[PDB]
RNA sequence: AACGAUAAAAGAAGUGAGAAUCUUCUUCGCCGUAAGGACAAGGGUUCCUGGGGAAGGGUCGUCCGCCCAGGGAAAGUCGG
RNA sequence: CGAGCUGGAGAUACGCUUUGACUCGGGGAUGUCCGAAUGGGGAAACCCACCUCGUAAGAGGUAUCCGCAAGGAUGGGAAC
């Protein structure tokens, strides 16, 4: 989520989260207007994390380049 | 004096038991689904489908027999405490309640 | 791409009774076209679409009170299959 | 209100340790503390009982009484009260934990 | 005082806590280069389904173009 | 800082926190469309492009004024 266990990927394996969270969050719209839905937080969390993904890569691009 | 009655019913009067009351009160709830009129299958089980079946046909056929109870004889009875038991994919369903 | 522009699911009863047949219908982001959506539904799934629309959909709604009324305006899409009648499961609803 | 920004944001209690009551009712009736806020400043204390009533519209056969809740408070008593008398803090000492005060009048223990 | 053109109404059936005034039926009448129908500007979601009844409706109102929930307008060729 | 938090409207459930959440300090990164806005157009938030980089997506450039290597500039400010 933040370590340097994570932050360790390319940009190949890492990019591929970044649309990981945002297909899944897609099949639980489906829910919300069916009564499908019981877990609120399955959306707070989520777009929490998507996150913490765009921001590190960021970060490669300015300590890295100056 | 603490007392337990309970029932044992076979699974030859519990599937169609619920077809019934499931497809019957599904003409009277007002659901913003669909219309009160037509309902399609694979819906009603997915609005309401998981605590609003099982435990609605419980507690309405179980107060049943309590109004008619009274109604019959005309007696307050004593207290009594249900305890909702683990519902099976399908078969024979118990219970027990006991009271003082 | 692909998994983007989206909204919420249909549940009508015209919706359905067509969906039998093999038509289907996700609504869509308040801001899309219809060349970028139309390869945002066949690769999202993995099947050929021939119609889709997409355009603004408003929607004053309220209860009581004198702090007016907001407008949500969420676009619609009603794409079809040619020989395909269901693709996982969503069509046997 | 000022949203009872009349003290300040912290609390001088915890949510684990034992208070008392007194400049109301029930007098030295000790108790432990539930849940509390510094916000609304609420004291839930197991002490203070007061019988309520909740009333619901129509869930699945209504049938509720009066049943037994607690009440909020606000800062009406004494937080860590062991000596038979109201204190304070103004003793602070350490173990082996350099993150954590610790709070003591003229005995030591908490 | 007035309840907003002197184109009127009647009965039966139903509903409902309660109906002259809502619904159904069958009659009566009035418009018919219109008091029919289709567009444009303009309004905005008034539309349709289920509900509701304080207020608006110059009486009632169980009804509404009133209040709430939901749903409803998918065109390479009609307009732009 | 510290053992609560999950905004006002306080309601329901799921959850976030003692591997230091919330909150307060203070810096960073994201920053749709409009707005001098300056890509071109235009009844503000709408329409239409062109070029370069490139798997799709997607990114950046694209007014005019003075020097014309950098850079600065015409907009906004109650009152003074």
Redesign the pocket.
Same mark, same amino acid.
């Given at each position: 989520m933040k370590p340097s266990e994570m932050r360790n990927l390319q940009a190949t394996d890492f990019?591929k989260e970044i649309?990981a969270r945002k297909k899944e969050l897609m099949e639980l719209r489906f829910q919300a207007?069916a009564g499908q839905l019981?877990?609120?937080?399955?959306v707070?969390?989520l777009r929490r994390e998507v996150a913490q993904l765009?921001?590190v890569k960021?970060?490669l691009?300015?300590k890295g380049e100056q | 004096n603490k007392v337990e009655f309970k029932v044992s019913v076979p699974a030859a009067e519990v599937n169609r038991a619920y077809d019934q009351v499931w497809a019957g009160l599904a003409r009277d709830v /007002?659901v913003?689904?669909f /219309?009160?009129g037509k309902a399609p299958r694979k819906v009603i089980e997915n609005r309401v489908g998981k605590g609003y079946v099982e435990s609605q046909v419980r507690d309405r056929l179980l107060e049943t027999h309590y109004s008619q109870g009274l109604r019959e004889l005309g007696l307050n009875l004593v207290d009594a405490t249900v305890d909702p038991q683990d519902v099976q994919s399908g078969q024979a369903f118990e219970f027990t309640v006991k009271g003082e | 791409?692909?998994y983007?522009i989206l909204q919420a699911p249909?549940?009508?009863?015209?919706?359905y009774s067509?969906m039998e047949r093999g038509?289907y219908?996700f609504w869509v982001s308040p801001?899309a076209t219809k060349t970028?959506i139309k390869?945002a539904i066949q690769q999202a799934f993995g099947v050929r679409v021939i119609?889709?629309?997409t355009?603004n959909?408003?929607?004053?709604?309220?209860?009581?009170?004198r702090?007016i009324?907001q407008?949500n305006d969420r676009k619609?899409a009603?794409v079809?299959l040619a020989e395909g009648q269901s693709i996982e499961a969503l069509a046997g609803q | 209100?000022s949203?009872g920004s009349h003290h300040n944001?912290?609390?001088h209690?915890?949510?684990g340790d034992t208070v008392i009551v007194l400049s109301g009712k029930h007098k030295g009736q000790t108790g432990k503390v539930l849940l509390?806020?510094?916000?609304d400043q609420k004291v839930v204390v197991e002490g203070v009982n007061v019988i309520t009533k909740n009333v619901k519209p129509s869930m699945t056969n209504p049938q509720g009484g009066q049943e037994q809740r607690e009440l909020a408070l606000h800062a009406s008593k004494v937080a860590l009260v062991d000596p038979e008398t109201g204190k304070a803090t103004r003793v602070r000492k350490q173990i082996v934990?350099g993150?954590?005060?610790r709070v003591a009048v003229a005995s030591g223990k908490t």
């Open positions: 990019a649309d207007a019981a877990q609120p937080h399955r707070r969390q765009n921001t960021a970060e691009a300015r | /007002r913003p689904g /219309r009160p | 791409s692909h983007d249909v549940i009508s009863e015209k919706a067509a038509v219908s801001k970028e390869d119609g889709i629309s355009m959909v408003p929607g004053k709604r309220k209860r009581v009170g702090f009324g407008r619609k009603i079809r | 209100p949203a944001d912290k609390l209690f915890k949510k509390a806020l510094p916000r934990d993150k954590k005060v």
